[PDB]
Amino acid sequence: TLNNIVSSLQRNGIFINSLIAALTIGGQQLFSSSTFSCPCQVGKNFYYGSAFLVIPALILLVAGFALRSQMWTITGEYCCPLECKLACLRFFSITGRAVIAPLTWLAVTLLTGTYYECAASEFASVDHYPMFDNVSASKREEILAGFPCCRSAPSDVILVRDEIALLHRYQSQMLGWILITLATIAALVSCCVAKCCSPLTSLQHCYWTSHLQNERELFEQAAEQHSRLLMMHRIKKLFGFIPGSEDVKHIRIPSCQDWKDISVPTL
Amino acid sequence: TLNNIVSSLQRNGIFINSLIAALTIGGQQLFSSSTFSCPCQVGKNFYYGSAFLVIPALILLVAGFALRSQMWTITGEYCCPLECKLACLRFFSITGRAVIAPLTWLAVTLLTGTYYECAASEFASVDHYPMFDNVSASKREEILAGFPCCRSAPSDVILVRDEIALLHRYQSQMLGWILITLATIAALVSCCVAKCCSPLTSLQHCYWTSHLQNERELFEQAAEQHSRLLMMHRIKKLFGFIPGSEDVKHIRIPSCQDWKDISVPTL
Amino acid sequence: TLNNIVSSLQRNGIFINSLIAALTIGGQQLFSSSTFSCPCQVGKNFYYGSAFLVIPALILLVAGFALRSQMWTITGEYCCPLECKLACLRFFSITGRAVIAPLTWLAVTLLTGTYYECAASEFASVDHYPMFDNVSASKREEILAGFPCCRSAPSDVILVRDEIALLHRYQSQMLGWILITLATIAALVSCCVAKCCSPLTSLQHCYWTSHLQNERELFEQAAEQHSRLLMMHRIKKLFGFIPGSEDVKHIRIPSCQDWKDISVPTL
Amino acid sequence: TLNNIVSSLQRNGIFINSLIAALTIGGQQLFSSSTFSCPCQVGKNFYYGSAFLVIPALILLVAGFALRSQMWTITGEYCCPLECKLACLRFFSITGRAVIAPLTWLAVTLLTGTYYECAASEFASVDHYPMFDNVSASKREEILAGFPCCRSAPSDVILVRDEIALLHRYQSQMLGWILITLATIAALVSCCVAKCCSPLTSLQHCYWTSHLQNERELFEQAAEQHSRLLMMHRIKKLFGFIPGSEDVKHIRIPSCQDWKDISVPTL
Amino acid sequence: TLNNIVSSLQRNGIFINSLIAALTIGGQQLFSSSTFSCPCQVGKNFYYGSAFLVIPALILLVAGFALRSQMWTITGEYCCPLECKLACLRFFSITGRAVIAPLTWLAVTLLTGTYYECAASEFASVDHYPMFDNVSASKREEILAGFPCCRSAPSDVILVRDEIALLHRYQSQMLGWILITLATIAALVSCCVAKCCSPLTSLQHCYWTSHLQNERELFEQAAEQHSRLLMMHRIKKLFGFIPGSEDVKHIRIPSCQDWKDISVPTL
Amino acid sequence: TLNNIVSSLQRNGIFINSLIAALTIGGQQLFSSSTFSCPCQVGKNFYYGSAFLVIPALILLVAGFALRSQMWTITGEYCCPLECKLACLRFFSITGRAVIAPLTWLAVTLLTGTYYECAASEFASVDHYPMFDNVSASKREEILAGFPCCRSAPSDVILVRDEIALLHRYQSQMLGWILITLATIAALVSCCVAKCCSPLTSLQHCYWTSHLQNERELFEQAAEQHSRLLMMHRIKKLFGFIPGSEDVKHIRIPSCQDWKDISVPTL
Amino acid sequence: TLNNIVSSLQRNGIFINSLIAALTIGGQQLFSSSTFSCPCQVGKNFYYGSAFLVIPALILLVAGFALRSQMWTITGEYCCPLECKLACLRFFSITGRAVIAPLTWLAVTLLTGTYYECAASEFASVDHYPMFDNVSASKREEILAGFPCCRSAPSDVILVRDEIALLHRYQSQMLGWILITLATIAALVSCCVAKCCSPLTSLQHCYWTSHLQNERELFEQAAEQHSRLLMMHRIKKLFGFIPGSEDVKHIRIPSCQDWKDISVPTL
């Protein structure tokens, strides 16, 4: 009853998506808590933020796309009527599986907000503050870029610092929620248009998907067994018996030429 | 006896609804305790409250609707007499399954009350207080929006702050209870009207539901097996044997054309 | 031997009632300890008490009534001689199962007494106290409604506060015990009148109950199997074989019309 | 070997009585330690004591009587020679099973003594004490009713308070032991008179008890199976096959009248 | 069902790559935390950094290449048309398996950044600092190379030290991300060119890979069994019976010459 | 399935090498942490270092060589054309297995560096230090050899001591890395030359290795069984029956001469 | 599969030697940490050291020699050509097994060094020390023998004491390493000479060892069974039946003489 439930879970896309989301959440939390530190320099901050904010998302998206075996076969069918639409639906299913990881990464890294604070701590709109009028532009940047990493000044400075940090946290969480809502709406309307443009009925779709999966699996197994039989026959021609048999009555000692004969695999 | 009880539980809707409610309660608690912080700015507070109060509820409702496989088939039957009523009952059952998640999310997030305090901490009716008469409107908003996040003033200020916070907690819990009662009454009267408008008797309903479920399952299994047999026959035409058989006597080596023959799946 | 004892317990109503009572006790304790706080305002207190005291009890009673499957069938038999009495006994058994939850909720929430103190902390009869003679009515309400939540005054005030709180605890526990006794007496006399008005003998009752339960179960199983056979026959007409068979000799490829043929389920 | 010992224990009345006593002891301890607090008012104390002392005992006694299935059948046989004596012995056995719970509740709640102290802390005979001569009657009651709950006075007051409390503890434990002894003697003499007035011999009694129990069990099982067969036959008349059979050759589609035919259960 | 899943995992390259990456991450963390200490001398620092940064990566790459059995056979086929392309694809697959370890080592050791700080703590561009103008070049190097290991100077020195360290951490993490992105893009375009230049179709590739693996395995097993039979025959010629048989009827005692006969293994 | 995986692991040389390396790492760590202490005398230090640095490595190398059973047979074949090359390859495989232990011992004991500090703490090049100019040569050695073990002097002394210790740690780790790289390169080029000078093809090598192993195993088993049969026959000649048989019909009592007959084992 | 691996381990001499070494290491550590204390008298110290250093080693060597069963048989064959050489090889194998224990005891007790310090704390060469010039010979011995056990003098005394102790620790560890190296070289050259002087070939040796072991085992088992049969026959002559049989038909009661008959065992 074990392998039954194992296959039932493997088929269930909800479980796979949940596992991917949970793994990305845990990985982001550990990654942030371990190897993140604001440089708080004058111009080398926004890049340090945008790197952690963007690059892992793109990387995980490319990984979720390329790691899908069927995508390579589809692309090979495309690289140098109805077939076009079926290929479109296959690409759509693969994209639906793949997009989950970078989306949840972006969502968590924006809702936590610790990356966005360090990302745009220099673009803070400082125009109506009492301590930022006399200071020159350079020292202004110097003291503005020093808020996220550490605190060393009197209470008024820490007050304006906490205010700016809270403003940026608000911006981050609002951006995160907007991303979540817009992305879910886009996914819903895309599934809707996929259902609308499908030339197949509701029942033919199930048959087609099962056909594709079962096709791949059986062709794999059959090619394996066929090559196994062929190699077994060549082995019997070399040595003189079957590798699986017992009490073999004839044992043909190989000659110095048949070793050269078996050197090539006939491709 | 394991898989027996597994199927008995899977059929039992009470267990599924209980699990959904428990998962939503736990998720809301963790989400609130982890990634929530009041910005306590002058105009960017009510939005920060309403986002967490509303958006996850709508998102979870849309997710509970779209993730139901039968809903897509019903909509496809609808998109471009008795059938209308049967489709109405199917939609009703799906809605009854789906609504549980956003309702419990709203209920818990209102009964805890920590979101509502941060949601309407600016609309506090301050008209009969001793310290809020001399202050101008702008500074009034400034000091009113600063209650939820932190406390830095003398005892009278913290007293009026605690009073306002308790008032808002009362409002939140009252709103939550009203939502619970109204929603349960609506669900009850809707089930009543569903029983009233049902053209089927009490016994035909059971037969119909079992018929629909069993229909989907058997058509799935049969289409799978049929496509499996067809692909097995094409494999026998290519290689010359059955993928499941042993001691195959004829092995037909494929030619350079039959590979091109098998390139297309006959749709 | 496991499923044997499982069914023996499921039949045993004592176990089900004990489990319901224990779950309600635990839920009330957690609910009270987590999300309860006295507002201690001037007029918005009694409602805050009565809500937690009453609304969950009514809600749980309605839930215990509607969640019983047989109640819906009985009501449908009633909505648009001996049958009347049998329906009365069925309704009586369902009511006996359902009433347990709200009764135990009320009992525990009155015996703990923390809700009743916050419910009627304003109706305290203050007429023979030394500090409540000079104060006006408004300030009297202000200082009377402030006892339950916090304490900030000298020792005489805390003394009269503890006295009033103890009086209200006494009232709550007395009300709880009266409710318990009256409710048990009512349940006993109702079971007595049910035994008195029963047109069936002592032995026919057992046969009737077993008949009803077994009837529902077997009709369920038989309708399931019948619909399964019918769908299997339609599948054989479509594809040309039985979904359970092996080594099928004929495989009928479907045409573009038979897909439309299977689109309707014949209701 | 498990279910063997399970049935051996279920038959053993000693185990059931021990379990009931242990459950009542634990429940009383938790109940007392959780929801008990002396009001220590002037006239609302004795009732607060007598409630916890008496009401749960009566309630548990009524519950132990009514929850016995055989008692209902016996009462129905009685409500509108030898049979009278046999019914008397059956009632006696049921009473012997039921009385255990309230007796042990009373015993434990008197031996612990914390309820009795709060029950009669006002009837304390104060006639030979140095501090209770000048005080008026009203203030005397006020200071006498304030001993159990709290202590706020100098050492002489706490001395007389401890003396009175110890006296009341002595009274409680003595009353408890008297109750235990008198109750056991009454139970013994009642079992003696039951053995004396029994018209059956020592051996016929065993046969009679086994007969009654086995009678109930077999009639239950047989009525269940009979109704199951009858419903199976009606199902075969409706659909055209047996719910348990496989490879049914005839499937009779139901008509719009036979659904109405099956609507009534023939009582 | 165990060995089934074991083989399924062994085939799954994703699991093997994940395990390799995790092992390298853990090993790097332990290695760094255990046996790393900055010498902070004048010229013997950059080498101490570059050693840990580079040498383990190269070593692990060579180990991942040479430990692959098929690579040795391919090289032997190469050392003293279509075969060239097939050998290229085999080398490509081996390289894809091997490169994972040094890449992840470099990535982790750059993202942690503790090696890079100690690597280039002497090339720090110190030109606009107040304390580094009067000091000579030698003492400048002396005080610049002493930042990473320890701190012993007043607050201005520790301030410029923290600034330089943060700058170098920024540089390290930026270099790490650039390496990750460039390496993934290179791997993707290399897989693309491998798919482009493949003379085999999408299906022949699967057959070819399965053929190679199965070929190696069966030739191994068959050669083992053949040599076993040959040695068994020589043993029967020496002693006079079969090593596996029971109740041997003839036992030939060996002579002083047959021991010399068996001394040589016939190569 | 257990013994299957056991044999698969036993064959896998990677596992054996990993286990040897891990055991040597753990043993070196414990050995160093337990029984190491610098004598810090004037001339008896370098020997104390070189002993722990070298002697265990040589000892473990000799142990890894001599403990290999096949090495003894090969040496006996050598002690008093193609056979020479085959013996060379066998010796090469044995050396490849054996060298792992002393190499990893040296590597770990140099990377930890605690042995090298105590090894060459007297050859420290002290020429440009302020405190080592006035002191005579003897006292110079006295104070130089006292750095590693303990510290008792003012801060300047501990400063120069830490500097010298860090220099020596740098030297140790650099020497360790050079040893690792040079040794791996030597092993790689040696495997290359072994592949180059092999007179056997790629496939004959596998057959030859399997032949040697299987040869040893079967000859062992067969010699055991043959001697067992011979001793069983002598026992039957002495006592008169077979040691394995049951219900022996003849029991020959031994005489005083046959005991002397069995005293010699016929060599 | 358990007893298989058990016998495989029992045959493996490496495991037995490892276990012996580990047991001796643990026993020496516990023995030293528990029951060792320096007497630090004037002439009764060197003996106290040499006892623990030597006597257990000799004792364990004698125990490892005498406890070997085959050694007794060989000595009996010796006590009152080729046989001489075979006996020499047997003695050599026994010695190789036995020597492991005292060697590892000596090694550990010298490397720990705590015994050697207490062994030669009186032979300390004190000739160039400032405090040992004026003191007479007797008091010199008194203060020299008091270093190891306790410390009671000013800092100069403890300084010279630590220096002497470190010198002796160095001597001990150097002696230990010399013993290890010399002993391993001796064992290696002895195994070499054993291989050189062996009149048997490489293969006859395996057969001979297996023959000796199997010979001992089978003779044991056969003698046991033979004596068992003989005693069973005497028992049948006494009582009249077989001790293993059931439903014996004749039971011969013994007489007063046959008891005397069975008194002697016929030797």
mmCIF file with all atom_site columns, C-alpha atoms in Angstrom, chain C residues 1 4-5 11 14 77 82-83 86 90 108 111-112 129 162-164 166-167 169-171 173-174 177-178 180-182 184-185 188 191-192 195-196 202-204 206-212 214-219 221-227 229-230, chain D residues 3 6 31 35-41 44-45 47-48 51-52 55-56 58-59 62 66-67 72-73 76 142 149 215-216 219-220 223-224 226-232 234-235 238-239 241-246 248 251-254 259 262 265 267:
data_model
loop_
_atom_site.group_PDB
_atom_site.id
_atom_site.type_symbol
_atom_site.label_atom_id
_atom_site.label_alt_id
_atom_site.label_comp_id
_atom_site.label_asym_id
_atom_site.label_entity_id
_atom_site.label_seq_id
_atom_site.pdbx_PDB_ins_code
_atom_site.Cartn_x
_atom_site.Cartn_y
_atom_site.Cartn_z
_atom_site.occupancy
_atom_site.B_iso_or_equiv
_atom_site.pdbx_formal_charge
_atom_site.auth_seq_id
_atom_site.auth_comp_id
_atom_site.auth_asym_id
_atom_site.auth_atom_id
_atom_site.pdbx_PDB_model_num
ATOM 1   C CA . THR C 1 1   ? -9.402  -7.043  16.230  1.00 0.00 ? 1   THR C CA 1
ATOM 2   C CA . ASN C 1 4   ? -13.930 -4.580  15.689  1.00 0.00 ? 4   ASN C CA 1
ATOM 3   C CA . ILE C 1 5   ? -13.227 -2.336  18.680  1.00 0.00 ? 5   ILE C CA 1
ATOM 4   C CA . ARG C 1 11  ? -21.698 2.598   18.202  1.00 0.00 ? 11  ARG C CA 1
ATOM 5   C CA . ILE C 1 14  ? -21.218 7.369   25.713  1.00 0.00 ? 14  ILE C CA 1
ATOM 6   C CA . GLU C 1 77  ? -40.062 14.409  4.551   1.00 0.00 ? 77  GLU C CA 1
ATOM 7   C CA . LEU C 1 82  ? -47.637 6.173   13.289  1.00 0.00 ? 82  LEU C CA 1
ATOM 8   C CA . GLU C 1 83  ? -45.209 7.887   10.895  1.00 0.00 ? 83  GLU C CA 1
ATOM 9   C CA . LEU C 1 86  ? -41.576 7.595   14.496  1.00 0.00 ? 86  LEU C CA 1
ATOM 10  C CA . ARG C 1 90  ? -35.931 10.214  15.361  1.00 0.00 ? 90  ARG C CA 1
ATOM 11  C CA . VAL C 1 108 ? -17.828 25.494  31.829  1.00 0.00 ? 108 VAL C CA 1
ATOM 12  C CA . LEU C 1 111 ? -18.242 27.637  36.465  1.00 0.00 ? 111 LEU C CA 1
ATOM 13  C CA . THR C 1 112 ? -14.986 29.308  35.474  1.00 0.00 ? 112 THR C CA 1
ATOM 14  C CA . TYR C 1 129 ? -20.304 51.666  50.664  1.00 0.00 ? 129 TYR C CA 1
ATOM 15  C CA . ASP C 1 162 ? -12.262 42.212  45.536  1.00 0.00 ? 162 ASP C CA 1
ATOM 16  C CA . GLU C 1 163 ? -15.512 42.008  47.488  1.00 0.00 ? 163 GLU C CA 1
ATOM 17  C CA . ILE C 1 164 ? -17.606 42.829  44.417  1.00 0.00 ? 164 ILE C CA 1
ATOM 18  C CA . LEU C 1 166 ? -16.098 37.597  44.800  1.00 0.00 ? 166 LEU C CA 1
ATOM 19  C CA . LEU C 1 167 ? -19.828 38.313  44.961  1.00 0.00 ? 167 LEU C CA 1
ATOM 20  C CA . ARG C 1 169 ? -18.053 34.835  41.152  1.00 0.00 ? 169 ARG C CA 1
ATOM 21  C CA . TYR C 1 170 ? -20.502 33.391  43.671  1.00 0.00 ? 170 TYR C CA 1
ATOM 22  C CA . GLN C 1 171 ? -23.435 34.441  41.509  1.00 0.00 ? 171 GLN C CA 1
ATOM 23  C CA . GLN C 1 173 ? -21.117 29.537  40.037  1.00 0.00 ? 173 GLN C CA 1
ATOM 24  C CA . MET C 1 174 ? -24.603 29.382  41.552  1.00 0.00 ? 174 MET C CA 1
ATOM 25  C CA . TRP C 1 177 ? -25.079 24.787  39.087  1.00 0.00 ? 177 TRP C CA 1
ATOM 26  C CA . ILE C 1 178 ? -28.736 25.729  38.697  1.00 0.00 ? 178 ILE C CA 1
ATOM 27  C CA . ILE C 1 180 ? -26.737 21.961  35.264  1.00 0.00 ? 180 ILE C CA 1
ATOM 28  C CA . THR C 1 181 ? -29.390 20.596  37.617  1.00 0.00 ? 181 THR C CA 1
ATOM 29  C CA . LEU C 1 182 ? -32.365 21.997  35.722  1.00 0.00 ? 182 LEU C CA 1
ATOM 30  C CA . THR C 1 184 ? -30.349 17.233  33.651  1.00 0.00 ? 184 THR C CA 1
ATOM 31  C CA . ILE C 1 185 ? -33.835 17.052  35.187  1.00 0.00 ? 185 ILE C CA 1
ATOM 32  C CA . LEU C 1 188 ? -34.445 12.908  32.310  1.00 0.00 ? 188 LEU C CA 1
ATOM 33  C CA . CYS C 1 191 ? -36.442 10.633  28.094  1.00 0.00 ? 191 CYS C CA 1
ATOM 34  C CA . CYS C 1 192 ? -39.210 9.449   30.427  1.00 0.00 ? 192 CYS C CA 1
ATOM 35  C CA . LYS C 1 195 ? -40.447 6.082   26.743  1.00 0.00 ? 195 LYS C CA 1
ATOM 36  C CA . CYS C 1 196 ? -44.057 6.728   27.780  1.00 0.00 ? 196 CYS C CA 1
ATOM 37  C CA . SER C 1 202 ? -38.971 -2.405  24.096  1.00 0.00 ? 202 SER C CA 1
ATOM 38  C CA . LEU C 1 203 ? -37.790 -4.929  21.511  1.00 0.00 ? 203 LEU C CA 1
ATOM 39  C CA . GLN C 1 204 ? -39.245 -3.429  18.327  1.00 0.00 ? 204 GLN C CA 1
ATOM 40  C CA . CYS C 1 206 ? -33.923 -2.008  18.728  1.00 0.00 ? 206 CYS C CA 1
ATOM 41  C CA . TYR C 1 207 ? -34.987 -3.642  15.471  1.00 0.00 ? 207 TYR C CA 1
ATOM 42  C CA . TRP C 1 208 ? -36.210 -0.312  14.119  1.00 0.00 ? 208 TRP C CA 1
ATOM 43  C CA . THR C 1 209 ? -33.004 1.583   14.873  1.00 0.00 ? 209 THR C CA 1
ATOM 44  C CA . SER C 1 210 ? -30.804 -1.143  13.420  1.00 0.00 ? 210 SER C CA 1
ATOM 45  C CA . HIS C 1 211 ? -33.093 -1.232  10.394  1.00 0.00 ? 211 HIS C CA 1
ATOM 46  C CA . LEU C 1 212 ? -32.773 2.485   9.723   1.00 0.00 ? 212 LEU C CA 1
ATOM 47  C CA . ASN C 1 214 ? -28.442 -0.624  7.975   1.00 0.00 ? 214 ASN C CA 1
ATOM 48  C CA . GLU C 1 215 ? -30.920 0.631   5.372   1.00 0.00 ? 215 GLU C CA 1
ATOM 49  C CA . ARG C 1 216 ? -28.967 3.817   4.775   1.00 0.00 ? 216 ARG C CA 1
ATOM 50  C CA . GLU C 1 217 ? -25.644 1.988   4.558   1.00 0.00 ? 217 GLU C CA 1
ATOM 51  C CA . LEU C 1 218 ? -26.761 -0.729  2.133   1.00 0.00 ? 218 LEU C CA 1
ATOM 52  C CA . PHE C 1 219 ? -28.622 1.659   -0.143  1.00 0.00 ? 219 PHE C CA 1
ATOM 53  C CA . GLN C 1 221 ? -23.270 0.786   -1.257  1.00 0.00 ? 221 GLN C CA 1
ATOM 54  C CA . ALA C 1 222 ? -25.732 -0.639  -3.779  1.00 0.00 ? 222 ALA C CA 1
ATOM 55  C CA . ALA C 1 223 ? -26.310 2.645   -5.591  1.00 0.00 ? 223 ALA C CA 1
ATOM 56  C CA . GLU C 1 224 ? -22.553 3.084   -5.840  1.00 0.00 ? 224 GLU C CA 1
ATOM 57  C CA . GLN C 1 225 ? -22.029 -0.356  -7.365  1.00 0.00 ? 225 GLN C CA 1
ATOM 58  C CA . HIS C 1 226 ? -24.949 0.033   -9.771  1.00 0.00 ? 226 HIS C CA 1
ATOM 59  C CA . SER C 1 227 ? -23.693 3.330   -11.143 1.00 0.00 ? 227 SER C CA 1
ATOM 60  C CA . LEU C 1 229 ? -21.548 -1.023  -13.566 1.00 0.00 ? 229 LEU C CA 1
ATOM 61  C CA . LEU C 1 230 ? -23.513 1.356   -15.779 1.00 0.00 ? 230 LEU C CA 1
ATOM 62  C CA . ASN D 1 3   ? -9.763  -9.522  22.925  1.00 0.00 ? 3   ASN D CA 1
ATOM 63  C CA . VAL D 1 6   ? -10.558 -7.441  27.071  1.00 0.00 ? 6   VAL D CA 1
ATOM 64  C CA . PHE D 1 31  ? -12.448 20.524  39.723  1.00 0.00 ? 31  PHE D CA 1
ATOM 65  C CA . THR D 1 35  ? -12.831 26.472  39.862  1.00 0.00 ? 35  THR D CA 1
ATOM 66  C CA . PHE D 1 36  ? -13.334 26.904  43.612  1.00 0.00 ? 36  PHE D CA 1
ATOM 67  C CA . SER D 1 37  ? -13.145 30.169  45.541  1.00 0.00 ? 37  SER D CA 1
ATOM 68  C CA . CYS D 1 38  ? -14.859 31.141  48.769  1.00 0.00 ? 38  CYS D CA 1
ATOM 69  C CA . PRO D 1 39  ? -17.115 34.196  48.413  1.00 0.00 ? 39  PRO D CA 1
ATOM 70  C CA . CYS D 1 40  ? -16.917 34.833  52.174  1.00 0.00 ? 40  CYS D CA 1
ATOM 71  C CA . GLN D 1 41  ? -19.939 37.127  52.160  1.00 0.00 ? 41  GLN D CA 1
ATOM 72  C CA . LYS D 1 44  ? -24.112 33.698  50.513  1.00 0.00 ? 44  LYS D CA 1
ATOM 73  C CA . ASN D 1 45  ? -21.528 31.223  51.832  1.00 0.00 ? 45  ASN D CA 1
ATOM 74  C CA . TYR D 1 47  ? -25.173 27.848  49.774  1.00 0.00 ? 47  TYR D CA 1
ATOM 75  C CA . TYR D 1 48  ? -21.859 28.081  47.929  1.00 0.00 ? 48  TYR D CA 1
ATOM 76  C CA . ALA D 1 51  ? -23.844 23.335  46.130  1.00 0.00 ? 51  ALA D CA 1
ATOM 77  C CA . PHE D 1 52  ? -20.435 21.792  45.502  1.00 0.00 ? 52  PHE D CA 1
ATOM 78  C CA . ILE D 1 55  ? -25.390 18.816  43.686  1.00 0.00 ? 55  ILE D CA 1
ATOM 79  C CA . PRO D 1 56  ? -22.632 16.915  41.817  1.00 0.00 ? 56  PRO D CA 1
ATOM 80  C CA . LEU D 1 58  ? -27.030 13.812  43.076  1.00 0.00 ? 58  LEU D CA 1
ATOM 81  C CA . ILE D 1 59  ? -26.278 14.577  39.430  1.00 0.00 ? 59  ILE D CA 1
ATOM 82  C CA . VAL D 1 62  ? -29.018 10.212  38.402  1.00 0.00 ? 62  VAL D CA 1
ATOM 83  C CA . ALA D 1 66  ? -30.433 6.567   33.730  1.00 0.00 ? 66  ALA D CA 1
ATOM 84  C CA . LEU D 1 67  ? -27.429 5.609   31.590  1.00 0.00 ? 67  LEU D CA 1
ATOM 85  C CA . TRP D 1 72  ? -35.216 1.685   30.891  1.00 0.00 ? 72  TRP D CA 1
ATOM 86  C CA . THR D 1 73  ? -36.574 -1.674  29.753  1.00 0.00 ? 73  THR D CA 1
ATOM 87  C CA . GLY D 1 76  ? -41.117 0.258   30.702  1.00 0.00 ? 76  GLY D CA 1
ATOM 88  C CA . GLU D 1 142 ? -18.525 40.172  58.901  1.00 0.00 ? 142 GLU D CA 1
ATOM 89  C CA . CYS D 1 149 ? -10.842 33.396  52.029  1.00 0.00 ? 149 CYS D CA 1
ATOM 90  C CA . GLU D 1 215 ? -30.481 -12.772 25.067  1.00 0.00 ? 215 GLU D CA 1
ATOM 91  C CA . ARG D 1 216 ? -30.019 -9.053  24.531  1.00 0.00 ? 216 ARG D CA 1
ATOM 92  C CA . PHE D 1 219 ? -31.577 -10.453 19.574  1.00 0.00 ? 219 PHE D CA 1
ATOM 93  C CA . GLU D 1 220 ? -29.629 -7.351  18.572  1.00 0.00 ? 220 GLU D CA 1
ATOM 94  C CA . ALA D 1 223 ? -32.618 -8.176  14.122  1.00 0.00 ? 223 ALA D CA 1
ATOM 95  C CA . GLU D 1 224 ? -29.751 -6.391  12.399  1.00 0.00 ? 224 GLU D CA 1
ATOM 96  C CA . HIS D 1 226 ? -32.848 -9.703  9.246   1.00 0.00 ? 226 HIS D CA 1
ATOM 97  C CA . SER D 1 227 ? -33.376 -6.057  8.370   1.00 0.00 ? 227 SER D CA 1
ATOM 98  C CA . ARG D 1 228 ? -30.236 -6.180  6.248   1.00 0.00 ? 228 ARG D CA 1
ATOM 99  C CA . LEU D 1 229 ? -31.622 -9.088  4.227   1.00 0.00 ? 229 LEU D CA 1
ATOM 100 C CA . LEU D 1 230 ? -34.981 -7.373  3.775   1.00 0.00 ? 230 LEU D CA 1
ATOM 101 C CA . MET D 1 231 ? -33.396 -4.165  2.516   1.00 0.00 ? 231 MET D CA 1
ATOM 102 C CA . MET D 1 232 ? -31.145 -6.178  0.204   1.00 0.00 ? 232 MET D CA 1
ATOM 103 C CA . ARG D 1 234 ? -35.921 -4.442  -1.864  1.00 0.00 ? 234 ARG D CA 1
ATOM 104 C CA . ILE D 1 235 ? -32.728 -3.183  -3.496  1.00 0.00 ? 235 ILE D CA 1
ATOM 105 C CA . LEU D 1 238 ? -35.390 -1.830  -7.526  1.00 0.00 ? 238 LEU D CA 1
ATOM 106 C CA . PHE D 1 239 ? -32.095 -2.105  -9.397  1.00 0.00 ? 239 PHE D CA 1
ATOM 107 C CA . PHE D 1 241 ? -29.128 -7.326  -8.666  1.00 0.00 ? 241 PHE D CA 1
ATOM 108 C CA . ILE D 1 242 ? -27.526 -8.087  -5.303  1.00 0.00 ? 242 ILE D CA 1
ATOM 109 C CA . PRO D 1 243 ? -25.324 -5.383  -3.718  1.00 0.00 ? 243 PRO D CA 1
ATOM 110 C CA . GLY D 1 244 ? -22.673 -7.978  -2.883  1.00 0.00 ? 244 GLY D CA 1
ATOM 111 C CA . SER D 1 245 ? -22.525 -9.879  -6.156  1.00 0.00 ? 245 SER D CA 1
ATOM 112 C CA . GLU D 1 246 ? -20.052 -9.410  -9.009  1.00 0.00 ? 246 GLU D CA 1
ATOM 113 C CA . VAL D 1 248 ? -24.169 -8.986  -12.645 1.00 0.00 ? 248 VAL D CA 1
ATOM 114 C CA . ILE D 1 251 ? -29.165 -4.194  -14.793 1.00 0.00 ? 251 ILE D CA 1
ATOM 115 C CA . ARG D 1 252 ? -32.707 -2.850  -14.545 1.00 0.00 ? 252 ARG D CA 1
ATOM 116 C CA . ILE D 1 253 ? -32.786 0.912   -15.016 1.00 0.00 ? 253 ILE D CA 1
ATOM 117 C CA . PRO D 1 254 ? -35.247 2.396   -12.500 1.00 0.00 ? 254 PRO D CA 1
ATOM 118 C CA . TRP D 1 259 ? -38.208 5.948   -6.802  1.00 0.00 ? 259 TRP D CA 1
ATOM 119 C CA . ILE D 1 262 ? -38.831 3.150   -2.322  1.00 0.00 ? 262 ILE D CA 1
ATOM 120 C CA . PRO D 1 265 ? -39.650 2.144   4.515   1.00 0.00 ? 265 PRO D CA 1
ATOM 121 C CA . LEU D 1 267 ? -42.087 0.830   9.046   1.00 0.00 ? 267 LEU D CA 1
#
